Design a protein around this ligand. Sequence first.
Ligand SMILES: OC[C@H]1O[C@@H](O)[C@H](O)[C@@H](O)[C@H]1O
Ligand SMILES: [Ca+2]
Length: 309
Amino acid sequence: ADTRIGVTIYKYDDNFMSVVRKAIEKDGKSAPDVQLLMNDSQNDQSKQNDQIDVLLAKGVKALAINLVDPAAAGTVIEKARGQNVPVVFFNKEPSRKALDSYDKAYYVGTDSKESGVIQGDLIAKHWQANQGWDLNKDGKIQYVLLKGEPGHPDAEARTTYVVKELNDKGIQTEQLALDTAMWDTAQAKDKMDAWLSGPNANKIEVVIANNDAMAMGAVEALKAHNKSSIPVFGVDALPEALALVKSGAMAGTVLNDANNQAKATFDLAKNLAEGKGAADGTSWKIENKIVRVPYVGVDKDNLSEFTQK
Ligand SMILES: OC[C@H]1O[C@@H](O)[C@H](O)[C@@H](O)[C@H]1O
Ligand SMILES: [Ca+2]
């Protein structure tokens, strides 16, 4: 009756993980037999490690961990193994060797590559439809790219495959600049402001961001320079970003399904806390201890299936 599940969020003010945290809390408030103990790791893996020791001292029956550093998976598994507590890692994917090292380690996330291919197809679709976006009329997309954290599975796959997909759809590309803005709105605004103040400013035709928070910072820098006709694409379909696709400030985004990843994390951690099989009594499909929830492309044409038009 007191099933205790310990949850760490790598940083509470990351925009997307804020949507995921609130949905896990909602699922916990809804289940009368579960108590969730939620922690903000404040983007520090040492802080997270200490929080996991306190959760284990408090007797949690399962841990649902969103890692600060994907490479710390082994440290967390060794803490959990000692007390035979199952661990459901979510959103930052650990290595396969770390997942295989413990039979009660699972992961809930997405297939990262798919969000890069869907973003590439959304760009391809809108580029073909808007020939005026080709400012210098050379048939090539001149773009800048705002990357998430270096080494994060989603940042690396989204950066690689958005361009690979455009080239496979037959659209040649020329990267004018690329830099990391660490998934953050303010850092992205500053980097875009710098590019709009440098020698390439007039040549930028498309802004590609690995997530919506960075797309939103770019939209702010573009408005400040009265360059709001430059299309911006993101990933996550945050409610604030959906507002920008409606107003045309953004051209498209990709739904990163926070509700189902939160639901799957909660369902697997509750089952495992109860000594049942991870997917018992659910529809989740676990393959090799991983659940991957699909990404969905979002633009003005299917916007009504995600928000009110
Ligand atoms: O690890 C946290 C990151 O996860 C990504 O999947 C998401 O697109 C980013 O916005 C950020 O939340
Ligand atoms: Ca061009």
